[PDB]
Coordinates of C-alpha atoms and ligand atoms in Angstrom, one line a residue:
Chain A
X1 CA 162.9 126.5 141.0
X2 CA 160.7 125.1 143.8
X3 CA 157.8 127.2 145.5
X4 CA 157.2 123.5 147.3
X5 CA 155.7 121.7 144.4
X6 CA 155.5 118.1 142.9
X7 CA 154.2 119.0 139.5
X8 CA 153.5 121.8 137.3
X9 CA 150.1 120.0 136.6
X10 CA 147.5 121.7 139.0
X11 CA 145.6 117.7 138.4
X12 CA 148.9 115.8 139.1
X13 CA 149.4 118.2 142.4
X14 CA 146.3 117.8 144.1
X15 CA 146.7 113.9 143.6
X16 CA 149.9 114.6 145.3
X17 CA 148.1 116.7 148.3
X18 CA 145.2 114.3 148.0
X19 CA 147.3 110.6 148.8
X20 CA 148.9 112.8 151.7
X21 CA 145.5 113.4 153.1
X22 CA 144.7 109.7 152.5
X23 CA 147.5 108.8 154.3
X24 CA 146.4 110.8 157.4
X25 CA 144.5 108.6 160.3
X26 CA 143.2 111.9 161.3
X27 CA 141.1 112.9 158.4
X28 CA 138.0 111.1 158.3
X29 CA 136.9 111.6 154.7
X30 CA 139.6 112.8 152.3
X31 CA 137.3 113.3 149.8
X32 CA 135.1 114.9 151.3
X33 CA 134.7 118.8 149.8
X34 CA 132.6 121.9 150.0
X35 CA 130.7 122.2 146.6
X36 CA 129.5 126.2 145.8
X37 CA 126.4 126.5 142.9
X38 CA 124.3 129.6 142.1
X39 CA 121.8 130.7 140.3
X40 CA 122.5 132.8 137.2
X41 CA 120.9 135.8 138.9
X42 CA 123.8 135.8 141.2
X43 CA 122.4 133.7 144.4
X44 CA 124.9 131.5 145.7
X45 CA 124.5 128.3 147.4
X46 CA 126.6 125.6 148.9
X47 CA 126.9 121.8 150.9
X48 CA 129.4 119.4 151.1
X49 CA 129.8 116.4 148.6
X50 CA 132.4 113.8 148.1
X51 CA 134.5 113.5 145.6
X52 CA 134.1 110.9 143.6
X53 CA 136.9 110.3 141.0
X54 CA 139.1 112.7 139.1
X55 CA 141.7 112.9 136.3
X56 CA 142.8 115.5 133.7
X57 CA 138.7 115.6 132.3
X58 CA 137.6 116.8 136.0
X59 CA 136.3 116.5 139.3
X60 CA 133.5 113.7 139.5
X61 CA 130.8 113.9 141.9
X62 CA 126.6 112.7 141.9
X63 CA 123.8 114.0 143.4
X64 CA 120.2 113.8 142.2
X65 CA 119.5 116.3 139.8
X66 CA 116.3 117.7 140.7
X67 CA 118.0 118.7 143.7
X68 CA 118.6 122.1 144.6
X69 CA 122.5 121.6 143.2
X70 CA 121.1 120.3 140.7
X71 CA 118.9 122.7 139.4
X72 CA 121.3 125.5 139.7
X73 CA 123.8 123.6 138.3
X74 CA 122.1 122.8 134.8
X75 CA 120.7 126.2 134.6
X76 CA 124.0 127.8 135.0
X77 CA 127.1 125.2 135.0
X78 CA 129.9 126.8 136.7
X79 CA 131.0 125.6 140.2
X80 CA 133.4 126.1 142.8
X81 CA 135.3 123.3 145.1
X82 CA 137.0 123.8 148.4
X83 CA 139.1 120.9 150.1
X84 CA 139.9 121.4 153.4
X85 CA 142.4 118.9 155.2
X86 CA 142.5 120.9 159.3
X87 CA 145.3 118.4 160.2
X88 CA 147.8 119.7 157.0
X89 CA 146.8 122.9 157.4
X90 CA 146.0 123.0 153.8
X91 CA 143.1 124.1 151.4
X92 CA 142.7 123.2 148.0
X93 CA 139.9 125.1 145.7
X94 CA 138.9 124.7 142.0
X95 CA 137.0 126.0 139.8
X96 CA 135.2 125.3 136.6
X97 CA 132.5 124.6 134.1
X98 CA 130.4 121.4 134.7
X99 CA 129.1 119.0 132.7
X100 CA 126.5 116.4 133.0
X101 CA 128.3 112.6 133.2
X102 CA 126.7 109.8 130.9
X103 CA 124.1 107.8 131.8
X104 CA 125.8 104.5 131.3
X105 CA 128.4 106.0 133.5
X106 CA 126.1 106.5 136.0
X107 CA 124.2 103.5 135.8
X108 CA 127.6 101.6 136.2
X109 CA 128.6 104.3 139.3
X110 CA 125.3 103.1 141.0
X111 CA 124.9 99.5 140.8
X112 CA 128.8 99.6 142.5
X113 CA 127.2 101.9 145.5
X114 CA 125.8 99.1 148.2
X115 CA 122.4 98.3 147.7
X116 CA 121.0 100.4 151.2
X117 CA 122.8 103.3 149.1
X118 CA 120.9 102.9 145.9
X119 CA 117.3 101.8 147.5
X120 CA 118.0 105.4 149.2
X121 CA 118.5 107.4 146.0
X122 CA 115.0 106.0 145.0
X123 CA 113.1 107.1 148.1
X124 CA 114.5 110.5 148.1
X125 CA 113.2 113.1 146.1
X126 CA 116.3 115.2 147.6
X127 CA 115.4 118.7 148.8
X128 CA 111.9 118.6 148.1
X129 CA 109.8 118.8 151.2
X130 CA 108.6 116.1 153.2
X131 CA 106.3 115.4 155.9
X132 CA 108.4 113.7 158.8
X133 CA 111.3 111.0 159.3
X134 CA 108.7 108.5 159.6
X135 CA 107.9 109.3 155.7
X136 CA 111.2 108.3 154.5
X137 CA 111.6 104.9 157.3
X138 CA 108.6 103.7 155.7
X139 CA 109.0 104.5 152.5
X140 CA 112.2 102.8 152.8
X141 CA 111.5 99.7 154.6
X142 CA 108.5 99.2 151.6
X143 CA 111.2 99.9 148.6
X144 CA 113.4 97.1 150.7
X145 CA 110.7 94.7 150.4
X146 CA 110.4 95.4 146.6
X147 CA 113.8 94.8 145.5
X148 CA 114.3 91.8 148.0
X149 CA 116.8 89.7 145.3
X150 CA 116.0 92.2 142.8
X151 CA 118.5 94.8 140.6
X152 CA 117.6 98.5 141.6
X153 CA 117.3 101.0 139.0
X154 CA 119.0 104.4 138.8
X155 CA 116.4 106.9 139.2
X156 CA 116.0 109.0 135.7
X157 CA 116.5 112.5 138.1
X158 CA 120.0 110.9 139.7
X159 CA 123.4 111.1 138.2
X160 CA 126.8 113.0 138.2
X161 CA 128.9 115.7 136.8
X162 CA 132.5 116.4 136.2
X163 CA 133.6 120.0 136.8
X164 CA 136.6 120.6 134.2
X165 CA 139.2 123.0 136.0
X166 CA 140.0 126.5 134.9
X167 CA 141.5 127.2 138.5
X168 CA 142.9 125.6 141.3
X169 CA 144.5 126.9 144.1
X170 CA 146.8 125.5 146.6
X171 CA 146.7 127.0 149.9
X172 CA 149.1 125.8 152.4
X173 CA 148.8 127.5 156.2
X174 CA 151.6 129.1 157.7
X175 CA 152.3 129.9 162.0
X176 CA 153.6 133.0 161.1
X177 CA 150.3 134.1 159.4
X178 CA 152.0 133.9 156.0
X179 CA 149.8 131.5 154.2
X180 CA 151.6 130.5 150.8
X181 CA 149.4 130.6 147.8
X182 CA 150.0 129.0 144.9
X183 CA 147.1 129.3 142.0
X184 CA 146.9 127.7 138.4
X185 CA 144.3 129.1 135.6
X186 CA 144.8 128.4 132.4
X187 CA 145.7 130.9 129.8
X188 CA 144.2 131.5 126.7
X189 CA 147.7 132.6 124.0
X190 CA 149.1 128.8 124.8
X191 CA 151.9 128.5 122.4
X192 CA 154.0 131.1 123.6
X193 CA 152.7 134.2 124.7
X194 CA 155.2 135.2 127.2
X195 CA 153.6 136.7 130.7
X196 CA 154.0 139.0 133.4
X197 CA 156.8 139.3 135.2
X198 CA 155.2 137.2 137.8
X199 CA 153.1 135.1 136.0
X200 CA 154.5 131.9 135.5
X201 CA 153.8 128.9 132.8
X202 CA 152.9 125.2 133.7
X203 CA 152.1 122.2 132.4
X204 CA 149.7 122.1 128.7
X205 CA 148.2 125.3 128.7
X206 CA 148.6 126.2 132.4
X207 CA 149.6 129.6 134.4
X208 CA 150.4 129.7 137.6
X209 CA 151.3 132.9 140.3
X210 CA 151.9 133.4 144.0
X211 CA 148.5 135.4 145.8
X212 CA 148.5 137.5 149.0
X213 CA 147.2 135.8 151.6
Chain B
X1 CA 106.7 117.5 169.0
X2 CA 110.2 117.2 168.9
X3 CA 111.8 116.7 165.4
X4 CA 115.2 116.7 167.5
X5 CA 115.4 120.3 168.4
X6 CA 116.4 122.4 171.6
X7 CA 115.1 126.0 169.6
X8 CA 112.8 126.7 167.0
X9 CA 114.8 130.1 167.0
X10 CA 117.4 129.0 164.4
X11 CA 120.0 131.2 165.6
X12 CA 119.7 130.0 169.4
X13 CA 119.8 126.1 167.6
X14 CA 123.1 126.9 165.5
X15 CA 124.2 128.1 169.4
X16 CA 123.4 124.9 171.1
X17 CA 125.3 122.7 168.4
X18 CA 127.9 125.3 168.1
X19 CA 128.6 124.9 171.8
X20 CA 128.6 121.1 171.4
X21 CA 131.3 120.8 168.5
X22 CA 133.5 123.4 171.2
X23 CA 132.4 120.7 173.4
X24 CA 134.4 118.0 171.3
X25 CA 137.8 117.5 171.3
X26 CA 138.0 116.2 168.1
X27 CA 137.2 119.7 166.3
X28 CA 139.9 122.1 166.2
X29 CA 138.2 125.1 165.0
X30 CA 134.0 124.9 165.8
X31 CA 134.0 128.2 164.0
X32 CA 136.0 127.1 160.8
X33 CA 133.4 127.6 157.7
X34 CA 133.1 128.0 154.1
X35 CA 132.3 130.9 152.7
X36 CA 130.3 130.8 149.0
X37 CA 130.1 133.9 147.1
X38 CA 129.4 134.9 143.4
X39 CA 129.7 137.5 141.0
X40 CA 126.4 139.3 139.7
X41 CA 127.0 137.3 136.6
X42 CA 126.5 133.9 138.5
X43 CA 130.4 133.0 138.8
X44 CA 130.6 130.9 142.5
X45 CA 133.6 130.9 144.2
X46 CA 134.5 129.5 147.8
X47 CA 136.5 129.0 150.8
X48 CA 137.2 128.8 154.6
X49 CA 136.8 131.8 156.8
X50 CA 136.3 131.8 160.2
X51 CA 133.2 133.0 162.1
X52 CA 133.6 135.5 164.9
X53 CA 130.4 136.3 166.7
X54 CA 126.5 135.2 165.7
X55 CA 123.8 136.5 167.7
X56 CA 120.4 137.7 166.5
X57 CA 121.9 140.3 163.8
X58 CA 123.7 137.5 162.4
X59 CA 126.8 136.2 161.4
X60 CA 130.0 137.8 161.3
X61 CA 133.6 137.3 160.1
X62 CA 136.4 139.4 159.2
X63 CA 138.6 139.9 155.4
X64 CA 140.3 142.5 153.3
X65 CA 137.5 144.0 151.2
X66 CA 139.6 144.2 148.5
X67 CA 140.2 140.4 148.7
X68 CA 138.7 138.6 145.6
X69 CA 135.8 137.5 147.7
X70 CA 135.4 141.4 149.3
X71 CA 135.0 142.7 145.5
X72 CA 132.4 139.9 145.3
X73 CA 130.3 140.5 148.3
X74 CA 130.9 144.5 147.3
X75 CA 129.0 144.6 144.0
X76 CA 126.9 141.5 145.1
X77 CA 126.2 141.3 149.0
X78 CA 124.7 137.9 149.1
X79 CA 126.7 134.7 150.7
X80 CA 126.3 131.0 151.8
X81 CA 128.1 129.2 155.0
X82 CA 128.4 125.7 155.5
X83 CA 129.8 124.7 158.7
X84 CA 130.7 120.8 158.7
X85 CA 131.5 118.8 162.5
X86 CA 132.6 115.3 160.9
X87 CA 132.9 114.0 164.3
X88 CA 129.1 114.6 164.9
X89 CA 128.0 114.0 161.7
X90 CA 126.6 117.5 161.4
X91 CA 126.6 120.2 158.8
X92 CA 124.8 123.5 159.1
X93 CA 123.9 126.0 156.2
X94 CA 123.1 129.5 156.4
X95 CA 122.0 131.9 153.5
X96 CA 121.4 135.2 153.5
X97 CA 122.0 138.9 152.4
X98 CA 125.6 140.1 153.8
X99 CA 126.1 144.3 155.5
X100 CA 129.6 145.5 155.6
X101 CA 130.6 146.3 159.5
X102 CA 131.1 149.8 160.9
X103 CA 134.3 151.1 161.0
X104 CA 134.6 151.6 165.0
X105 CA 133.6 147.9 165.4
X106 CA 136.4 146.7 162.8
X107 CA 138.5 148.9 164.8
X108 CA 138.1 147.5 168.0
X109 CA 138.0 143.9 166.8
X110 CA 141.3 144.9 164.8
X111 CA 143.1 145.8 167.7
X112 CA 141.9 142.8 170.0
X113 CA 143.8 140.7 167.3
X114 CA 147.6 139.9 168.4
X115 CA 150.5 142.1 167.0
X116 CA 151.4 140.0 164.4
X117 CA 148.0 139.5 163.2
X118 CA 147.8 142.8 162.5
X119 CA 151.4 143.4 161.0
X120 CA 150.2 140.7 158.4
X121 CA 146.8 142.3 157.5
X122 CA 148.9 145.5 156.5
X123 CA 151.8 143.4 154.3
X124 CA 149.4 141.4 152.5
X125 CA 147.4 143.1 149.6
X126 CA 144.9 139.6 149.9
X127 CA 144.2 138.0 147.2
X128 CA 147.1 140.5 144.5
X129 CA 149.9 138.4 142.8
X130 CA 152.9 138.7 144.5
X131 CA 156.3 137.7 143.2
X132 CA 157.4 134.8 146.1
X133 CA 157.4 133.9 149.8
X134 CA 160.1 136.3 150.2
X135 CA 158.8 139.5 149.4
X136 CA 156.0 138.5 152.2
X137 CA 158.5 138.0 154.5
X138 CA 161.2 140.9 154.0
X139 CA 158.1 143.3 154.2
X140 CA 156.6 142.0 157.2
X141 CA 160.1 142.0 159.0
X142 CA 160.6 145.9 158.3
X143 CA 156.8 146.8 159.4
X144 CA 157.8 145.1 162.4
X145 CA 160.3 147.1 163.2
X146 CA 158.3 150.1 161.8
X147 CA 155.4 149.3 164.4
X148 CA 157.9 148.3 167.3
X149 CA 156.4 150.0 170.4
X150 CA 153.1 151.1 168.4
X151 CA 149.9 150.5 167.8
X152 CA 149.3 149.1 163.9
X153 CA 146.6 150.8 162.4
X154 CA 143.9 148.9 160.6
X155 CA 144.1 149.4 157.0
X156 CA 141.0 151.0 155.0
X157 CA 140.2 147.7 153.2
X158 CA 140.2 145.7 156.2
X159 CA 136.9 144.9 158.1
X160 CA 134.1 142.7 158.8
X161 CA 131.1 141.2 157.6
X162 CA 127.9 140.7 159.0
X163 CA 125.0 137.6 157.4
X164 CA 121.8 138.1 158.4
X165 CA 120.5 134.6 158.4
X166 CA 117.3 134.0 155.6
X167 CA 118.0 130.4 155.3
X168 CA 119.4 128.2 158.0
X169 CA 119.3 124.4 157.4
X170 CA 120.1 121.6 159.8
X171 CA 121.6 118.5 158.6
X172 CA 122.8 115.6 160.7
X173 CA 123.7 112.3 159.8
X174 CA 122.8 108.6 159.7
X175 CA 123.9 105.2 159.0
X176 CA 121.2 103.7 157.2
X177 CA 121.1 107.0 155.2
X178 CA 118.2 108.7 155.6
X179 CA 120.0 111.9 156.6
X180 CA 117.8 114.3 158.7
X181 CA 117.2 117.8 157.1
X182 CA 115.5 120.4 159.0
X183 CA 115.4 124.1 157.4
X184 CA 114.2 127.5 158.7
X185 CA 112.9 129.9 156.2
X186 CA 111.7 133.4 157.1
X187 CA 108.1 133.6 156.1
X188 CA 106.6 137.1 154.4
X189 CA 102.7 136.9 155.4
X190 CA 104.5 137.0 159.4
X191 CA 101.6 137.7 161.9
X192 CA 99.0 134.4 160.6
X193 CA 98.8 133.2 157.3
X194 CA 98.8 129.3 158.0
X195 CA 100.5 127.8 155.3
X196 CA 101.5 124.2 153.4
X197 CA 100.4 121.3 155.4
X198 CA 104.2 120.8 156.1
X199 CA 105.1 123.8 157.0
X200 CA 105.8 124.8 160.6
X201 CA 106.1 127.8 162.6
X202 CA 109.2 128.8 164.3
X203 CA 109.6 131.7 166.5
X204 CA 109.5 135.5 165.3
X205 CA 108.9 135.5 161.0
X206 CA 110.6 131.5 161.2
X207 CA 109.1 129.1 159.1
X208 CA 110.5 125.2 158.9
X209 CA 110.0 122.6 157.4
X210 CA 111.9 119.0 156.9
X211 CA 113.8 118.6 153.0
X212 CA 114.5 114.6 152.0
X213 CA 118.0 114.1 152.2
Ligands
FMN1 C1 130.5 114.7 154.2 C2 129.3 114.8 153.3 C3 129.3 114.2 152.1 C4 128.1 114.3 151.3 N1 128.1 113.8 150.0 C5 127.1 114.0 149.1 C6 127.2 113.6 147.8 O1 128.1 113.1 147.2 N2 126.0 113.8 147.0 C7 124.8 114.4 147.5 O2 123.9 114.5 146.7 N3 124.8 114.8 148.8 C8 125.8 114.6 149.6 N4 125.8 115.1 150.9 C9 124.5 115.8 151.3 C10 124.6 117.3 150.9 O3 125.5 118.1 151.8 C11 123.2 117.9 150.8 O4 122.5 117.7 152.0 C12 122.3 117.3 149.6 O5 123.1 117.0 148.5 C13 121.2 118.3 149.3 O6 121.9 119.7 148.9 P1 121.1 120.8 148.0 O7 119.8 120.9 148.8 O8 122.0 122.0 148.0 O9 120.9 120.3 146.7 C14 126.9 115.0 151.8 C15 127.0 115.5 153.1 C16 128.1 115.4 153.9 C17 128.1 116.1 155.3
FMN2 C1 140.5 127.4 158.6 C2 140.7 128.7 157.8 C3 140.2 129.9 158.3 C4 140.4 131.1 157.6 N1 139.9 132.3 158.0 C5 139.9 133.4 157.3 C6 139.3 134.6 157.7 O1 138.6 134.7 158.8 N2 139.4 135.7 156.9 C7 140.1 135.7 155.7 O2 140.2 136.7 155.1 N3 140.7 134.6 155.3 C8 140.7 133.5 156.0 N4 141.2 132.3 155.6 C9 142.0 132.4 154.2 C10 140.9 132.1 153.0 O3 140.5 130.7 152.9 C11 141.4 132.7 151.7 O4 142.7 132.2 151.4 C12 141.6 134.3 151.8 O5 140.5 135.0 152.5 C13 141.5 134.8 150.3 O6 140.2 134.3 149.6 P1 139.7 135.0 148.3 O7 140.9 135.0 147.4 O8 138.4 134.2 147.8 O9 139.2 136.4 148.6 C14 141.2 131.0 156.3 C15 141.6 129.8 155.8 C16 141.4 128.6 156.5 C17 141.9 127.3 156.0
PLP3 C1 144.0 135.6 156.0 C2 143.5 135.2 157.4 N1 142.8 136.2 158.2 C3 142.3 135.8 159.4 C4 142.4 134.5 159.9 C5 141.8 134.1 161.3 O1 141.3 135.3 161.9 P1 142.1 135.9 163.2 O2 143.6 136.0 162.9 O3 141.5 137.3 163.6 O4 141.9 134.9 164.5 C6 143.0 133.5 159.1 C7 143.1 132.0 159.7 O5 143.6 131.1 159.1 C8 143.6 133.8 157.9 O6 144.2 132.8 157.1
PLP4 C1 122.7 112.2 149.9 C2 124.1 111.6 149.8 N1 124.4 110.9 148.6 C3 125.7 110.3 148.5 C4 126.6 110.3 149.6 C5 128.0 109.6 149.5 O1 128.1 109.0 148.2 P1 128.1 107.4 148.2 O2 126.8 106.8 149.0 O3 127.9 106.9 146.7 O4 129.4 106.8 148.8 C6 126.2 111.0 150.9 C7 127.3 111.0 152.1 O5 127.0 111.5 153.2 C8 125.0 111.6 151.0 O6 124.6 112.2 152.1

């Protein structure tokens, strides 16, 4: 077989690619990724997140919801990832539907981020428009003094996602200009609906095929 | 004044940190970026291009128009960038309408391109299922030896891009968290229609203002 692959299980592979990356004293933040939103009317929009946790249910992030992410994303949940690792030469991307994570799950996801981190979610109204810097050091400083010894609470508006994956590409760079490209999608006659003739089948209900680069 | 900012023409402040991540030695490609486009439909999708040339007009890059992203931008000409300098602890975003590039000036950035470069952008139908890495590689031997001695002419779906920047925000990092966001807006009533008490004014139709992180 072998088109250079570990498993036939697009989640299994990108753990594979991802420990590498770990692994790498050059890359600063493994996890860190390029998430793409839009609106439904077609406007796209995009920053970079980090990746927090991820299994066969998805790709686990948070962010504040009343953020400009976050209002695209819960009035049209469909999203696009890009990892980029410069020192591999590699690119991963996935995409899928998201959905919103529990609160309890967030609330435990919180209180496990350092306290500075939490006391920072509650000061920021993130994306909506403030005055200065001096706005946000004081409001800080004041929120600091408030929860001296005290248990912060998840804002209501602050949470996470999981994006399920219908796609994921492996992109792996190549000197000679050749980039190999290896994407998974899953199909929709799982069971045995036999393929193109270069369409091949993976793991569960996954697809994969070589693309053009 | 001073919020931190050498221009409050966006496009001459995107040049001054440009130049400073070419300045680093940790960044390998200052012009690497991700590219976020969508369908009408509101489908996102994403990945890493790289920039070549900005100036007033806006930014430009190069890609096979029949590429999945090149049908995208075709029947939907809006796009995001996010450029991301993890050894300055910067990120910049741009948004704004996208114009394909005339012909002429894909030629002559075609041909400034080395050989091989070229040889590859005629093999590779971007973004078409092929069957392996060897049907890449047999085809780009024999155009090789097609092209020996000649000049390679561009294909018809190959070309360039140009953004012009609507949206340009300015994000750079800090340790207790309070990340700072500065974003540049182009303004409709341009000429003097004072606006929100915290909004600025930039130079030409350039409005900013600061966004909590
Ligand atoms: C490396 C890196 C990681 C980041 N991680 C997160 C994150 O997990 N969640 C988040 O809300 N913002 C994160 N940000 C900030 C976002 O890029 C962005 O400024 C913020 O979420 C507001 O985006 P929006 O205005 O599109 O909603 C990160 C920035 C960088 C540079
Ligand atoms: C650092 C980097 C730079 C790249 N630059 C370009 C580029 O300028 N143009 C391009 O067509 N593809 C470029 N690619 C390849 C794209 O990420 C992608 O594989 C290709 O354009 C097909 O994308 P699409 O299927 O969304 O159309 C680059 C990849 C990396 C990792
Ligand atoms: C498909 C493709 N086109 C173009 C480029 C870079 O542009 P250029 O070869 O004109 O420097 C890359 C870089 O990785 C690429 O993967
Ligand atoms: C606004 C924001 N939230 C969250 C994070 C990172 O997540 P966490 O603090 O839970 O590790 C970042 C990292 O830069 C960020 O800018």
């Amino acid at each position: 077989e072998e088109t250079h692959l570990t498993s036939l299980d697009p989640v299994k592979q990108f753990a594979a690619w991802f420990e590498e990356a770990v692994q790498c004293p050059d890359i600063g933040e493994a996890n860190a990724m390029c998430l793409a939103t839009c609106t439904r009317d077609g406007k796209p929009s995009a920053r970079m997140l980090l990746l927090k946790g991820f299994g066969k249910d998805g790709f686990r992030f948070f962010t504040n919801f009343e953020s400009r992410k976050g209002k695209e994303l819960d009035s049209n949940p469909f999203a696009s990832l890009v990892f980029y690792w410069e020192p591999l030469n590699r690119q991963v991307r996935v995409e899928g539907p998201v959905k919103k994570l529990p609160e309890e799950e967030a609330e435990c996801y919180f209180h496990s981020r350092p306290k500075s981190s939490q006391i920072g979610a509650v000061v920021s109204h993130q994306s909506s428009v403030i005055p200065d810097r001096e706005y946000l050091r004081k409001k800080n400083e004041e929120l600091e003094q408030l929860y001296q010894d005290q248990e912060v609470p998840k804002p209501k508006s602050w949470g996470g996602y999981v994006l399920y994956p219908q796609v994921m590409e492996f992109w792996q760079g190549q000197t000679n200009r050749l980039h190999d490209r290896i994407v998974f999608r899953r199909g929709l006659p799982t069971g045995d609906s036999p393929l193109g003739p270069m369409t091949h089948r993976g793991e569960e209900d996954w697809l994969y095929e070589r693309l053009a680069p």
